[PDB]
């Protein structure tokens, strides 16, 4: 008998930006960016905060796509505090600098 699983199909356009979700309150920017370096260099890494608390999601960028890819998996499903860091490639990037003038 002889069998085997193949099909890398890891090919994809230049995508280094990663979308991180489920960021425990304890986990802060540094932490996140610190839990990604081990995979590849980072140029843009920050977590969205609602002023005082951590929304629960951030963004991480790498030097090269390949390096970013791994992280996605090497991370996706990795527990640190209570919930697993939901890591996934961000097909599209939403850059809308705005906010509700109120308080």
UniProtKB/Swiss-Prot annotation:
The modification Phosphoserine is found at residue 37. It is found in: Cytoplasm. The modification Phosphotyrosine is found at residue 86. Residues 16-92 form the RRM domain. Transmembrane segments: none annotated. The modification N6,N6-dimethyllysine is found at residue 83. It comes from the Eukaryota. Testis specific. There is a cross-link at residue 83 (Glycyl lysine isopeptide (Lys-Gly) (interchain with G-Cter in SUMO2)). Binds the poly(A) tail of mRNA. May be involved in cytoplasmic regulatory processes of mRNA metabolism. Binds poly(A) with a slightly lower affinity as compared to PABPC1. Belongs to the polyadenylate-binding protein type-1 family. This is Polyadenylate-binding protein 3.
């Amino acid at each position: 008998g002889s069998s085997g699983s193949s099909g890398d199909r890891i090919t994809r356009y230049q995508v280094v930006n990663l979308y991180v979700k489920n960021l425990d309150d304890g986990i802060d920017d540094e932490r996140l960016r610190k839990a990604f370096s081990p995979f590849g260099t980072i140029t843009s890494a920050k977590v969205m905060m609602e002023g005082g608390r951590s929304k629960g999601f951030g963004f991480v960028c790498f030097s090269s796509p390949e390096e970013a890819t791994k992280a996605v998996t090497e991370m996706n499903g990795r527990i640190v505090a209570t919930k697993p860091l939901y890591v996934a490639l961000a097909q599209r990037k939403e850059e809308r600098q705005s906010g509700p003038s109120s308080g």
